[PDB]
C-alpha cells in the first residue's frame, strides 16, 4: 500500500514544496504559467468548470463553480486527472454540464458562466501537451551506459537500462542480474567512453574494453544501443577545460569535506587521492575503514555541490563525522593537519553558488533512499544550509537522514509518485 497524502493535505498549516523547487520534475518549467485561483474544466463526479483553491506540489484543492461552501471541495492530482483549460470541451464537441446539486440553482447558465469567466485566469491551451512531453525520459530501454559499481565504487561497470519509471532508470549490470535504480540526471551514470577519456576505472566486456582502447579521438566504434554524451546532464562544459582535459586546480593529497556516498547522513573529511581529467577526481572518505585496494575511493567532480572546503561543517554548525581513529569531541582541522602534515584544499578551488531554490524548513516532499533507490519515501526538509539540504524521513531517526543538494535528482514534489506510478513509502506502523 502506497502512502496517501490526503489526510495530510486536508489539514491546515501543511507546508509542501512547490513543483518549481525541483528542476528535474516534470512540468517544472510551465508551473509559472499556473497560478492559484484559475478556472479549469474538470471531470464531473461530462466536464464542469472549477477553481484551483490551493496548490501543494502536484496536489490541487479544487471547487466547482456554483458551490460557495467549502464542504464540497475536493483534492485532485493536477497532471493525472481529466483537467483542462477552459474552452477545451467546446473544441472536443463536449457540453459543459452542471453538477446534480446545483443544476437548478441558477436561472441563466449563460450569464452565470460568462460572469464567472469574464476576466478570469486560466491555463494556456498547450499546457498538458507540455506536461506529457516533460514526462518522457531521454533514455530508452536497452541502452548501454557506464555507471558506478555499487559493489566497488572505485570503478564504473557497463550496464543496461532495463526499466524506466518516469525518469528513474533501472540499470542492470552486464555480468550480473544485480542492479540499481537511478535518475537520468544523476552524476553516477556516464556515457559510453566516459571512463576511457576521463581516466576512471572501468569494468566491462573484453570487446568493450578493446573498443574503448582502439578508439582514437572523435572516431570510436559506437553501437546502436550505446548511450552517448548527448543524454547526460552535466554540471559543467568541456569549454571550461583545455583539449587534453588536464586540470591544474586540485592536487593529490589535498584535504576537504565531502558527503559520504555510502552513508548520506554524514559529511566527512576527505582526501584527494587521484586527479583525473576534465576536473574529475577520485577522493576517499577519511572515516572509511582502511583499504589497500583503493576500492573505497569515490569519484567526485570538482564542481560538485557535495564537496566542501574544510571547516564547512564548523561554520554552518554541522555534525562532522571524524576520520578513522578520531573521536567526535576531540577533533579539529588544525590538529588534524598537524598530524598528517597535509595542506587543506584552497577556498578558491570550491565554487558554491546558492540559487533561489525556494526550499524552506518544514516543506514536505518525496525523497528517494540513496542506499535503496527502489524506494521513494515521505520526507521533510530539516535544514537549509545555503544550497545544501538535510532531508529527513517522516517517522524515523535522525541518523537515517541524508544531506542532499537542492538540485538533487532524488527529491520530488508531493504527488510525484502518483504521477509516475511509483510506490511511495510512508512512515512506519
Amino acid at each position: 500500500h502506497s502512502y496517501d497524502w490526503l489526510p495530510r493535505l486536508s489539514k491546515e498549516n501543511f507546508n509542501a514544496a512547490p513543483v518549481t523547487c525541483f528542476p528535474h520534475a516534470p512540468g517544472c518549467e510551465v508551473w509559472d504559467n499556473l497560478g492559484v485561483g484559475m478556472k479549469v474544466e474538470v471531470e464531473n463526479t461530462s466536464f464542469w468548470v472549477a477553481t484551483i483553491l490551493e496548490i501543494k506540489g502536484y496536489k490541487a484543492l479544487m471547487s466547482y463553480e456554483g458551490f460557495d461552501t467549502d464542504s464540497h471541495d475536493f483534492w485532485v492530482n493536477l497532471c493525472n486527472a481529466e483537467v483542462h483549460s477552459v474552452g477545451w470541451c467546446a473544441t472536443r464537441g463536449k457540453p459543459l454540464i452542471p453538477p446534480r446539486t446545483i443544476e437548478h440553482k441558477y436561472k441563466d447558465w449563460k450569464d452565470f458562466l460568462v460572469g464567472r469567466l469574464s476576466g478570469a485566469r486560466t491555463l494556456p491551451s498547450n499546457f498538458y501537451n507540455k506536461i506529457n512531453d516533460s514526462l518522457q525520459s531521454r533514455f530508452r530501454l536497452g541502452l548501454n551506459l557506464e555507471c558506478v559499481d555499487k559493489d566497488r565504487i572505485s570503478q564504473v561497470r557497463l550496464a543496461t537500462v532495463t526499466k524506466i519509471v518516469g525518469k528513474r532508470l533501472f540499470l542492470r549490470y552486464f555480468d550480473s542480474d544485480d542492479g540499481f535504480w537511478c535518475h537520468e540526471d544523476s552524476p553516477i551514470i556516464h556515457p559510453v567512453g566516459w571512463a576511457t577519456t576521463v581516466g576512471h576505472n572501468l569494468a566491462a566486456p573484453q570487446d568493450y574494453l578493446e573498443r574503448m582502447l582502439a578508439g582514437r579521438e572523435a572516431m570510436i566504434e559506437v553501437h546502436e544501443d550505446d548511450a552517448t554524451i548527448e543524454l547526460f546532464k552535466m554540471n559543467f562544459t568541456f569549454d571550461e577545460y583545455y583539449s587534453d582535459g588536464k586540470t591544474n586546480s586540485f592536487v593529490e593529497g589535498m584535504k576537504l569535506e565531502a558527503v559520504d556516498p555510502l552513508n548520506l547522513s554524514s559529511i566527512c573529511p576527505a582526501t584527494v587521492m587521484a586527479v583525473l581529467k576534465f576536473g574529475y577526481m577520485m577522493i576517499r572518505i577519511d572515516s572509511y575503514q582502511p583499504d589497500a585496494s583503493g576500492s573505497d575511493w569515490f569519484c567526485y567532480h570538482e564542481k560538485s555541490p557535495c564537496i566542501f572546503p574544510a571547516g564547512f561543517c564548523s561554520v554552518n554548525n554541522i555534525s562532522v563525522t571524524p576520520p578513522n581513529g578520531y573521536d567526535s569531541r576531540t577533533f579539529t582541522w588544525e590538529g588534524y593537519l598537524r598530524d598528517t602534515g597535509a595542506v587543506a584544499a584552497g577556498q578558491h578551488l570550491f565554487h558554491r553558488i546558492i540559487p533561489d531554490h525556494g526550499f524552506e524548513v518544514g516543506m514536505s516532499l518525496e525523497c528517494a533512499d540513496l542506499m535503496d533507490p527502489r524506494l521513494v519515501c515521505v520526507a521533510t526538509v530539516a535544514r537549509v544550509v545555503g544550497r545544501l539540504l538535510k532531508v529527513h524521513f517522516d517517522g524515523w531517526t535522525d541518523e537515517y537522514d541524508q544531506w542532499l543538494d537542492c538540485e538533487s535528482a532524488d527529491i520530488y514534489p508531493v504527488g510525484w509518485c502518483v504521477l509516475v506510478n511509483h510506490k511511495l513509502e510512508g512512515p512506519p506502523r
Binding site: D32, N33, L34, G35, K39, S85, V86, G87, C89, A90, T91, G93, K94, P95, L96, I97, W109, K110, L113, V114, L117, S118, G119, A120, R121, T122, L123, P124, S125
Partner: peptide
C-alpha cells in the same frame, strides 16, 4: 518575457454556444 494574453474560449451547453474572453500566461 512572460506576459498575459487574451484567449477567446467557447462553451457548449444545451442547446446553444457562446464565447468568453479569459487570460492565459505565455
Amino acid at each position: 518575457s512572460r506576459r498575459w494574453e487574451q484567449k477567446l474560449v467557447h462553451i457548449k451547453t444545451m442547446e446553444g454556444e457562446f464565447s468568453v474572453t479569459m487570460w492565459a500566461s505565455g
